[PDB]
Every structure is written in C-alpha cells, then in structure tokens.
Amino acid sequence: EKKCPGRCTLKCGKHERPTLPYNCGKYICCVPVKVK
Helix, strand or coil, rough: CCCCCCCCCCCCCCCCCCCCCCCCCCCCCCCCCCCC
16 A cells, blocks of 8 residues: 555665665655665
8 A cells, every 4th residue: 555656664765766675665665765
C-alpha cells in the first residue's frame, strides 16, 4: 500500500533512488524513498 508521490516509509537519505528496495528506502518504493 504506497501513498505517493515520494514514499518508501517516509522521504530519502543514503543512496537516493526510484522503486528499488536498496540503500535509501528498503520498503514500499516510489522516489523520495526512506533508508536501508
């Protein structure tokens, strides 16, 4: 359940990125994704 335009829990930090569970958001990913 994503609530976009910028969400993977909240907005970016480490490797700032769209759609991958990654480095910025490891979670439900739009583009201002959270963190690993």
